[PDB]
Write a protein that binds this ligand. Structure first.
Ligand code: HEM
Ligand code: HEM
Ligand SMILES: N=C(Nc1cccc(-c2cccc(NC(=N)c3cccs3)c2)c1)c1cccs1
Ligand SMILES: N=C(Nc1cccc(-c2cccc(NC(=N)c3cccs3)c2)c1)c1cccs1
Ligand SMILES: C[C@H](O)[C@H](O)[C@H]1CNc2nc(N)[nH]c(=O)c2N1
Ligand SMILES: C[C@H](O)[C@H](O)[C@H]1CNc2nc(N)[nH]c(=O)c2N1
Ligand SMILES: [Zn+2]
Lengths: 411, 407
């Protein structure tokens, strides 16, 4: 079966056939679309089909499908599953696996960059202290003094689900949040719950607006341990505006390295429960969501006040006006300090080109419109006008429950 | 079965049971989501009639009453004989209101029950249709104080005798491709603007030339009519701060009135059913003015603003876009023409969704269409999970008449 998507601005039509190699479910049916829903151990039994399908993809990509080397690898994985109830990926398979999970990430606008991903194999790690060391090297290599490079670090896979490696942090670098007894929050409201855990585990909190959280690291199913990232490794950017001199006096800064550490990497049925990956920021992630979400730093009010906007009625578009100024500020600050960043116009245009290229080379590009369209200025970016097909391919990144909800405390 | 939707900004969770009364299909399967795609007999008829009458008598608290059964019997006999049936006035009014209530792509549904229905089922000619349309326009415009309305022409019979309004909206501006090479007026209407000329319209050849109506009664060739200009309320666009703005020479019409959709009530198809309400500001300022394939004036406005257009990262398109939208809202409001801003409308829609969850057990909603085309995440709808599904009565798309009608 063939499927077409149309671009309503340019009238380009593309044909998707890749959706035919699609495994997992969407959440939708014939009678319901769950397109806007945010969230819609294995036996040998289910493991060998997933192993084989992965190895068939792998051996196609290297043009060795059906070769002696292909068949022996199959037989060897087969034996290893039936013998040990699991198996080990080679280096090369791991690398290809990790690239493809990224390539298959339908909610990622940054995928033009998928083939350049530094993969660090941390599958020999056994302790939290080891995890800390791998992460520090990740952060240093990725940061690269402002010239950001994509990378992922991959810790040992799940086995019985009782020995999991987890990074309790949702991102490697993120600011604390402290709910005050008057109901207001100091610092980032998103991170209040995690911050408390940290305090519980023995972190002495500076209790300021921009405190980098400590790493909370679980190895081999053990209780997690606190570690401070060395501040010399945390690249940060003070926020100023190119025309508004009072902007700096708002006291804002942000970190340069976005590094997501709570997702699950699935490759050939194996589950990598700690696989922090990092790239660089699209400006609107900071200036729209991080600063302007009502449930975040929410600075729209203060910025609007200082711009002396008419705030007495929403139809003045004072929110809209302040939001753009803040986003101009974020891009200006990052560029002036030479820290890699991409604006939403440039990021969405690159993605359109990637997507077409993917239809040509691969037969499709799965994509989630709800996520790919930027949280401001939607229709003046080319993605808004692009029809997109959403389906799940493996390898992939998946959500997993928060570890504090599932962890069995050894004490 | 029972499905939850969460608002991620407020944590509010709603349970949806209304989707289990879903009748039509979405485009999606277990394996592909088509959420972003723009366009995904006597036998057929009686179930359809029954399902609709069942909901009607239920809404008026008379489900399973003599009057209910008696009507079911009546429609059955008329179907058995005539191979169609006629709706009673009360059912017609109910069908139309509910078609609006069920429009998952419509952010303005808080108002769904305040809908004026004009029964035009006794119409027989394009001249008749013209008169009904002028009355609809005048009623709805109401000197700037806009009122929702729909006018319903006769239902399809054998699909040989169709009533259609060829215009996609009652009031749109003309589009002419110029010897130079580009486009004069509205590029969306270029092809239609030429079909009107190929039919005999004498175009004033300006930018904002209100198109002539092209009306088809009973499957006949369609006919041209000019809407009396005094019926077409327009707004000169100016900025509350930038005096040069008016120099661009922009105006827009006050009355949005969609005229190409098909209204489906109890299996009956009303292929001409123009309906109108009022604008959300972003429809003109973001889409009509700034879309690349529309009036595309962003570049022009940015210039007059002396913005740095050297690099996309100055967000000059974004800055301009906001001022344009401030100007639309300001002009309409100054002139006492009804308009709603995207902040207000989305807040209203959240309020509506909540009403429908408790009073009805859900509310079909298409997130891709409900989130405004600018400032998405600063409106409450952005953080709202929505379930999308198709209930009847409904509005549907239909092929463009000119690809179907035989001359
Ligand atoms: C290289 C620079 C990159 C840019 C500018 C970029 C951009 C983005 C943006 C803007 C989002 C939406 C985020 C949100 O709203 O929370 C996203 C989502 C995603 N990205 Fe990329 N990305 C980049 C690199 C990567 C890399 C290296 C990976 C993994 C190797 C990745 C995997 C994903 C995944 C899994 C999601 C979805 C998260 C979720 O479902 O919650 N991204 N990316
Ligand atoms: C009262 C003021 C109203 C406002 C502010 C409003 C707002 C909107 C908006 C912004 C859209 C998306 C339009 C687009 O991007 O093209 C929309 C779509 C829709 N509206 Fe409402 N609306 C209103 C009244 C009505 C009425 C009276 C009806 C019918 C009785 C209706 C039925 C629909 C339908 C069927 C669609 C989408 C059609 C499609 O699937 O393409 N609306 N409306
Ligand atoms: N808030 C969520 N996700 C979330 C929260 C915070 C950050 C991110 C995220 C994910 C991937 C990429 C990005 N942004 C980036 N530019 C990168 C991070 C790592 C490499 S690129 C952010 C995603 C949720 C998902 C499902 C329910 S909530
Ligand atoms: N853009 C489309 N349709 C379209 C074009 C122009 C206008 C509208 C539309 C529909 C309903 C409401 C509105 N806006 C309004 N405020 C109203 C119109 C009538 C009552 S309210 C616009 C819809 C398409 C759908 C599928 C392919 S193109
Ligand atoms: C491809 C995509 O679905 C298309 O551009 C949609 C997106 N969302 C929209 N939303 C509204 N309200 N109106 C539209 O015309 C569109 N266009
Ligand atoms: C309910 C809805 O799916 C949710 O708020 C989504 C909408 N689109 C998004 N898009 C991106 N990139 N990131 C997000 O967190 C969200 N949130
Ligand atoms: Zn879907």
């Amino acid at each position: 079966r063939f499927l077409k998507v149309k671009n309503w601005e340019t009238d380009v039509v593309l044909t998707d056939t890749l959706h035919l190699k699609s495994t997992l479910e969407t959440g939708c049916t014939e009678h319901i679309c769950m397109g806007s829903i945010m969230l819609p151990v294995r036996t040998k039994d289910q493991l060998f089909p997933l192993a084989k399908e992965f190895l068939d993809q792998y051996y196609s990509s290297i043009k060795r499908f059906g070769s002696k080397a292909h068949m022996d690898r199959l037989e060897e994985v087969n034996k290893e599953i039936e013998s040990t109830s699991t198996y080990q990926l080679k280096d090369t398979e791991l690398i290809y696996g990790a690239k493809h999970a990224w390539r298959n990430a339908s909610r990622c606008v940054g995928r033009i960059q998928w083939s350049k991903l530094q993969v660090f194999d941390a599958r020999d790690c056994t302790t939290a202290h080891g995890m800390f060391n791998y992460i520090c090297n990740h952060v240093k290599y990725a940061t690269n003094k402002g010239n950001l490079r994509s990378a992922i670090t991959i810790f040992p896979q799940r086995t019985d689900g009782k020995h999991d490696f987890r990074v309790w942090n949702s991102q490697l670098i993120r600011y604390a949040g402290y709910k005050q007894p008057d109901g207001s929050t100091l610092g980032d409201p998103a991170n209040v719950q995690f911050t408390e855990i940290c305090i519980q585990q023995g972190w002495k909190a500076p209790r300021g607006r921009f405190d980098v959280l400590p790493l909370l690291l679980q190895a081999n199913g053990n209780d997690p341990e606190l570690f401070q990232i060395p501040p010399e490794l945390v690249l940060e950017v003070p926020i100023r505006h190119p025309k508004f001199d009072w902007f700096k006096d708002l006291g804002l800064k942000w970190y340069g390295l976005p590094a997501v550490s709570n997702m699950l990497l699935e490759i050939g049925g194996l589950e990598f429960s700690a696989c922090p990956f990092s790239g660089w920021y699209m400006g609107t992630e900071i200036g729209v969501r991080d600063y302007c979400d009502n449930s975040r730093y929410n600075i729209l009010e203060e910025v609007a006040k200082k711009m002396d906007l008419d705030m007495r009625k929403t139809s003045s578009l004072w929110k809209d006006q302040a939001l753009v100024e803040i986003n101009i500020a974020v891009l200006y600050s990052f560029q002036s300090d030479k820290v890699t960043i991409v604006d939403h116009h440039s990021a969405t245009e690159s993605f359109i080109k990637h997507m077409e290229n993917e239809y040509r080379c691969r037969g499709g590009c799965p994509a989630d419109w709800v996520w790919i369209v930027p949280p401001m200025s939607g229709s003046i970016t080319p993605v808004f006008h692009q029809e997109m097909l959403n389906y799940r391919l493996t390898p992939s990144f998946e959500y997993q429950p928060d570890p504090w909800n599932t962890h069995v405390w050894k004490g």
